[PDB]
């Protein structure tokens, strides 16, 4: 398991960081900061040691950091460091990794 | 006496927003060769709004909005492009009744060449628009209080189909409800009325007259 | 586990495209865009690693790719991938697959 | 007839011509029935709708039900 | 695990199709169309590979194709087939066979 | 497992003093949910032996005490000490620690 800004997840739980929305769509038009949204779209900057379970050893969690991920649109939680947002969601909420 | 001649589309409904404004002299907004969009329903909503907007700034013209109402977020978009990249956008509310709302903008659309948005049965959605159903104006004036919009162009056997229509209507029409003469005026104008308005010192001069 | 538009599903998802619904049906009558339901024969597009459970080892998925497949009605989420619509099940959640070859004669 | 079947009715009759028209029945409760059966005989059969022989509408045949002229 | 009309269910499913509903009953007397109403004998014509969970291997369905079975009134999932109604349920679900 | 001010937790239990909670109120006027607290900065100050389960033998608790750790908004019950608020949460329900040392 390993850590970011001086913070470790616990057990199954993976930190991320929302990548920076749509100010611009597509044509030319402008939208304002907040309109109606979160950004499914964000990057793992963290991740637990694993839940342990489904045995008696440890399984670590199925991302390893910095990988681009999608997330669902209701669950986990927020948190901030250094008055910067991100967000904290279980590794089986997860719905999808990014490949290059 | 005097004698006006009203031809155009011209009903007494003003923009939402004062940022709209175009002219700073007379506080109207003016605009040439513009598109027009109905919408039936409410636009609070963004992903209705936004490709309506797309298409506009892709053909370069000014764009003014019809609508039951234009609020929530969809209205901080059209005054955020309008204040800070001169977007031609205008938005005003619908004439304003409630089953009348429906007859009046269906005649605009029918006038403008173009269709209406939200529901009679078969809905067209806002999010899927295409150039040939919005609207096309050869001149649109607003103020605070209302709306003139000029030289709208859509099918002349079509309008006259529905001036046919509303005469036919109105004729058999057992009715205190005057309005469907104010319909009639609205979508026989840029073809034309005439409203005489007569004067003299007092009413009773005035209705005998 | 393979991938689809740069989008790699996780643990026990499959993701599938739904095949377009019918516009036009027998004969030569066309039907409005309300009358359809969400259409529920699919092809799916891409698989997850599988589920590690049931076991110590993972488990693989039960579909292969470009499989003909038939959904339940409910539990799908949707993504969006180049600006069109795909949808992501739970492997369990499938409930039929559609075979690609023949046994006798 | 409204619903969904009218929706199918237009927009699909504004299509490569095809002539389709929906009317309300003659109606007001117990005498539409009378009515329908009346127009139903002297365009030679026809029944659909709750029933005494009971006739669904999925199940149709082209000599259906009754015949016509103009 | 077994198919039919191009058809294979999966994991613990089975696929059956409803026994015709009777018109003539007991007395002499006929009855409408609309009188019932779902069948509870069905007759079974496709079969899933099995449910992984009842062991590290695979544990194979109960019932054979084309065993004779009682449904219960509730469950299952109707399917439609070149243009046929079949219905689809798991096989725990499934309460009874009748032999033969 | 280890105690504090003569209380130890049991199972799975950790003992945390949280700084201060009140964000419903500022000063004296009501706020609007922002996430208006869904994540509590606390120190652990007490930890239980450890939970009997997923063995035959007890599993001790992922945090030692001492450690500064993130709660969540909701499940933590509060006990008090020596007329002093501090709350106690499941070692599973505990969201985070904060590290010490590159």
Redesign the interface.
Known sequence: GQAFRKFLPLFDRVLVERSAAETV????????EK??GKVLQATVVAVGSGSKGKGGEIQPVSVKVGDKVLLPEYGGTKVVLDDKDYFLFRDGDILGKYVD | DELEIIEGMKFDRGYISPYFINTSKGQKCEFQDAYVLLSEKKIS???SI?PA??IA??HRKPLVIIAEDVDG?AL??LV??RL??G?QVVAVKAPGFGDNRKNQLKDMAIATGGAVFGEE???LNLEDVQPHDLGKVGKVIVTKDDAMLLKGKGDKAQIEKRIQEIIEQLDVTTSEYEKEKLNERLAKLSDGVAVLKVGGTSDVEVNEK
């Open positions: 769509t597509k044509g030319g038009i402008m939208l304002p309109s109606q | 909503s963004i992903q936004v907007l797309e700034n892709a977020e901080s978009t955020l492009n800070k990249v977007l049965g078969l809905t």
